[PDB]
Structures are given as C-alpha cells and as structure tokens.
Amino acid sequence: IHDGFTLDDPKRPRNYSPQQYMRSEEEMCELFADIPEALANTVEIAKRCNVTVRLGEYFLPQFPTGDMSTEDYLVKRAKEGLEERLAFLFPDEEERLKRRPEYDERLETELQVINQMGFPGYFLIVMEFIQWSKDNGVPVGPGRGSGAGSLVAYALKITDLDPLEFDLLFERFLNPERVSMPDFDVDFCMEKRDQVIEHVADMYGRDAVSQIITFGT
C-alpha cells in the first residue's frame, strides 16, 4: 500500500519473511544457541543507553521589554489597553466613571492569576501578533477557545468580545485553583500563513519557528 503495488505483482520487492514477528526471549535464545554473545550483547547495549527526555512541562519565552519585567510591561499595556476600550464603549466620561469599577476589579483579579501562574510573556507575544495581523491584511479565524471570557484579552485586542456584557467567565479558560495549562489554542486564517510565519520569524527567529504535522491514517 505504501509502495503503490499489489501483493502478487512480480515487480514487488520481497525482502521480508514470516519469522519477523514478536518472538519471545526463549525463542530467540534457541534460534541463536550457537552465538550466545549475540543475545547477551542486546542486554549490554540496552543498559548503556540512557536518555532523559522530561515531558509534559514547559519552557517559556519573551518579548523586548527593555530592562523592565515582562510582568510589569503587561500591567502597563493592560491598564492602557483597558483605557482604549473604555473610551470606545463609553465615550461619555461620566458613564465611564460609574460603569468602571467592575472592569478594574475584573482586570486586577485576572492580572493576579496570570502573573502568579507565570503567564505574562506568552500573552504579550500573542496580543502583539494578533494586533499586527489586524493592521496588515491577515484574516484571524473565528476561534478563541474560551478566551472570550477574558476581559483582559478583550482590553488588549486579543479577542473581540466584551465578557462583562455577556457574563463570560475567565475561569473556564484559565482556572487558578487547578494547574490549567496555556491550551489557549489560538487560530488564524490558513490562507495567510506565509505573512504570519514571516512576522514571527522576524520576531523570534526562523529556526525557532516550525509547522506541526497532522497525519494520513
């Protein structure tokens, strides 16, 4: 099937035998009872081979923050991103004052969990990336995971939905009382991949960037 041929085709290579199954230890011990070294050398080689690959646990990255914390860069851009959105939503300053406390309380409650879980660099990268692709002609996909429940995402123009308007909850998306990963699973339109690959290579390095294979099954 791989080669593209049928079993009984004469042109087909016949390099393989019915003995190529999972023989037991004993079956191999009898097959080679004349060359015991050959069996024993498998055991020996296997004990010399010891690779540690730790799995399921992360490695983080960054953004030009000058001599500032990445944490503190986020705090700054989020307060000030909140200011943009608030003037768009409530362009009357009297209303903005009365409606404001809810947003500030939401903002710092989220900010606490993001920073205490060690997120800030990651969200910064992504928000900048999302903004740049809006400025330029790069379609972003409809998906947001449960990211619409973050008012900070919205404030930062990461998302397009006001979670306070529609009672959307951040804790479905990142839960502080549970090690919850950064599954955030953000998408963009696949047509415009080359433009985005380009920006994120300029940003972080062409060698630090790669596509992910799927599968033919």
């Binding site: 070294e37 004990k47 010399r48 010891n50 540690t52």
Partner: peptide, 21 residues
C-alpha cells in the same frame, strides 16, 4: 556458529547511568 568473539560489557559508569535510569 562457534568461533571466539568479544562481548562489550557495560562499564561501571554506564551501569551507574542504568541504575539512575
């Protein structure tokens, strides 16, 4: 089929790595 032949045995350092693994 018979005939003398060397058998590389794991060294003590490799055995330490084995134990740790």
């Amino acid at each position: 089929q018979a005939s003398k032949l060397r058998v590389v045995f794991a060294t003590d350092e490799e055995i330490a790595a084995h134990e740790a693994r």
